[model samples]
Target chain A: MIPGKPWDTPQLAAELERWKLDGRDVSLLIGGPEGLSPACKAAAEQSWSLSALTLPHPLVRVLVAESLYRAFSISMKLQLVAVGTKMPDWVQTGFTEYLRRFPKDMPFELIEIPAGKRGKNADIKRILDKEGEQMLAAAGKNRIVTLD
Target chain B: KPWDTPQLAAELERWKLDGRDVSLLIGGPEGLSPACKAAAEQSWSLSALTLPHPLVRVLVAESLYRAFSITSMKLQLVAVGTKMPDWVQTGFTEYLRRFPKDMPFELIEIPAGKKNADIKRILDKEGEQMLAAAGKNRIVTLD
Candidate 1:
């Protein structure tokens, strides 16, 4: 039920600025290992992600505080190639929110590639090979930073 | 000693006020040597808990952002209530002590009306008092 796509710190900072400009009061909810319950997520209007990696619950508070401070202190545009063919409506909405904020010259983009198939009978190696090729094709000559 | 969040924020504030740009170095597996440490003005330890290098990087980045994000604006917590019971007073006092001395935080307490007071009139009087106390400050009503 996490509403937003995975966003980097700078993106979050920019969003924070938007909130300030709109005079929106935000309340943050930090979740545990499994993350916030569906009901908890539903009660909130938006949800942002810090990292794909699971963070220690205690550390998230510090991270969130620093993100807010950085946003307030304030302030970037980048393309992200994620391996997921489709995303939820909220994710697209959240992504577009950041997208619209950027100036024409400094645009942000998110390119999602179809995820590799997975099941007991699936060919894991072939899946990775095809997915990896598609990712490299999408990546082009840009400097690569592999999440894996 | 390790720097707490507020102390880190204060340090960043100082740097910003002084119009300085800081470059922070993160050591690798062996960590920074004595000579490397000596090359800097000062050094800081993030925590007593040994953290992964990757986590340290994220923490440092986030910490930098949070430190710079702080504002000079003052914050106030306005409440409507009778005299706080001793236990509540004691609990509140302990929590408030954790904030940095320089932090611009204040508490405004407006007394609740007498038991027999008319509800509508009580609300009207409290509303006026609250707004009067607020003055030109931006207000965010809790309820």
Candidate 2:
């Protein structure tokens, strides 16, 4: 509970580099109905805000987990562009060229799925169902996001 | 989608009930971006789950984008307990497409923290926009 204010992107980046440099870390609590006991309050420099509404015992953990881990992971992997489904030379070159920039292990990957064909074969359910099976098969034993 | 949780689903249900615009915060390395902390109430996300910080940023945004995609367009919420099945992506794309413009439908992420003065500037700008969004004659009243 270092107690600080909200950081915008550029500022976050700057401070993040500092953390990387100093090697001193900070922690914030994800709280519930009863937030930060008296002792906890004394410990923090202040508190952060998300909204005015009541955040319950439940979701706060989620809000915390997602956010805490969220910052640590950066970098991007744009997903499959259709038609151009991996078949698009432009898509290939673009992704190939970019993915190479980052190390083998990445901080993040933003997978962008192109729009599906809308006119004919447009029975979306059938198409989704058919393709869904294909993707699941590809995602074997938790391969993580084989979906297009 | 796999990361979706009951805790999250319930929060949205509550937000629908509260019916007020909201803001959340995340601090700088030291903690709240001075601006966001003052105005925002607060917040969290993730797995792999111990990721380095940069991707944490991207993952948070993408995860929410994915989560909200399912819940929007008046779409059925995909359950939160498990990893989203492989097909939900296609199912949700239509949902995202059917989804209307803008995010009334949302904004919830911890920004890194910073100086109160710098933070104040960010808060003021958002405060002005939020004020406008608050509507001309919509102030809460005894009426």
Candidate 3:
């Protein structure tokens, strides 16, 4: 986790290169207030902001750790199958978005939920309602949900 | 330390005494029925249902195991803090009605980061304000 306002690019690049040489992938942690430095931005192979909304740095770290663990588990389970064939479009879309947000060079696979087999409409509706309420409780009253 | 088998046996015995029969329920693409929900003596609400069914199974199992561990260790269950008072529920619903038809911001973010300390902070502040205005403390302590 690189810290400070002006991110040291050369230092970050050197560190990333060291990790690459060791056959390890790197993930750069960026925050709202402390944006990435030009040098670090140029050197970073991939970067992903924790949330569009400003999250506390400490909370961001916890989120990152949990996400990393989930991603690692998904990778290990050999669940990343081809899109449309095995995975659902929504899951594929989400996974791709994550990848796009954080460009990586590893042989990463995508997991999809099967089409037409998402869930019962009533069940999904109920779940979505409950989830929507919880999210509103979490995100606050300023955010709105838009469905196309 | 007792191994997995003995530990599980002890757990089952304790649950049986409490009139609890733990069963792993999996809803296929189509979710559970009203009958299923009715059969459950009590249903615990998860934070969200947006999660996939398969993922929910893993989460539920993990949560149950965590609960068991907490019980065994006599650890405090943090969820006891989220108990909603009757007045708070009324206030929350009323608060919802004042918004526009499509206006999103219904969910109140607990000021954890820059806001308040945590959920406790949010509830305490709101409760105190409510009590002060009403001239009485009507909050129900779940614990």
Candidate 4:
């Protein structure tokens, strides 16, 4: 039977594990697109979305590239919501539920944003501004992705 | 052209403008059978490896509708399927969500996969059914 969930990066890992014996180093992801939702731009919830961070050809890469959702540095629930409407009451409650799945093992830098109250209509621009400055400083003059 | 549906839609728009039809070809692993692949005007690899067969079917369906779900769309449903399973519906539904719900697939079943006889016999049966469904329409097969 077709699996209920998306063929998201992680689950494909188990199948991919076997391909390594073939000496292949690449990965798999496929099929997809879209725009933003108003509530998302305002995000009246604990969850954060990267829809704005989404890119093009590379986005296709994101779709086709393989991974193991089995391991994660983050947990997110993404659904396309239409624009021009007031935020729904449950976006908050629902997002918080997906947040609960982001177990501690995923990593320390990560956090779970609940759906309601505390994060509702969180100021997206304000958050982005603070984060940009914070990240540049945290890098400490240089950053490197290791071959090690 | 290979990437987005905009131009393909544009092309189809021209065809529609002239009251003509457009044909798109898709295929399975071991690739499209000789006659079909060789018949198409153009072909390219839209990639995914070890793509479970059922998923590929949905991908093609989704891409076709994606092309149609543009400036103007329609409600036309026609398909030829080989030993299609319920699992296929689940995946189809997933992709269908992205679509505008104007069209749905009309499927015809054919004998497929491993079923008695040699692998050759199974293929002959599939090819036979596909030829029947295909009728006078143009067909293109691929890798």
Candidate 2's docking class is incorrect
Error of 3 at B81 (Å): 16
Chain A TM-score for each of the predictions: 0.42, 0.29, 0.22, 0.22
Off by over 4 Å in 3: A1-78, A81-96, A117-148, B1-110, B113-123, B126-143
Model 4 CA deviation exceeding 4 Å by range: A1-148, B1-53, B70-112
Candidate 1 structure quality by residue, lDDT tens digits, A16-127: 4555566633333333222333433444454444343344323322332233234334302223444553433322343345435445553235555566656688865566
**Tens-digit lDDT track for model 4 on B1-143?**
24233433344334335332223322221223344334434443444223333334344444433433441111222222332222232333433334445453223333233535465544444455454454433222211
Q: Taking the tens digit of each residue's C-alpha lDDT, what string does model 3 give over B23-112?
A: 322222333334344343333322221322122212222333343333201111111112221212223333322333332111121121
Q: For residues A1-148, could you state the per-residue lDDT of candidate 4 as single tens digits? A: 1232222234323333433344432211111111122222222211222222212221121111111122222122211111111222222333334435446553212111112221587755444334333332332322111000
- What order do candidates take by DockQ, descending? 1, 2, 4, 3
Question: Which residue runs of candidate 1 sit more than 4 Å off their true CA positions?
Answer: A1-78, B1-143
Quote the positional error of residue B129 for candidate 3 in Å: 5.8
Angstrom error at residue B80, model 2: 33
- Per-candidate clashes come to 3, 61, 13, 20
Leading candidate by lDDT? 1
lDDT of 4 at B87: 21
RMSD (Cα, Å) for all candidates, in order, is: 21.2, 22.8, 25.7, 24.9
Q: Model 1 chain A, poorest ten-residue lDDT window?
A: A59-68
lDDT for each residue of candidate 2 in A1-148, tens digit (9 for 90 to 100): 2223233344344544554465433332222222223433334443444232232222222333343233324222222111112222322343444444545463333222232354665766544444343433322332122110
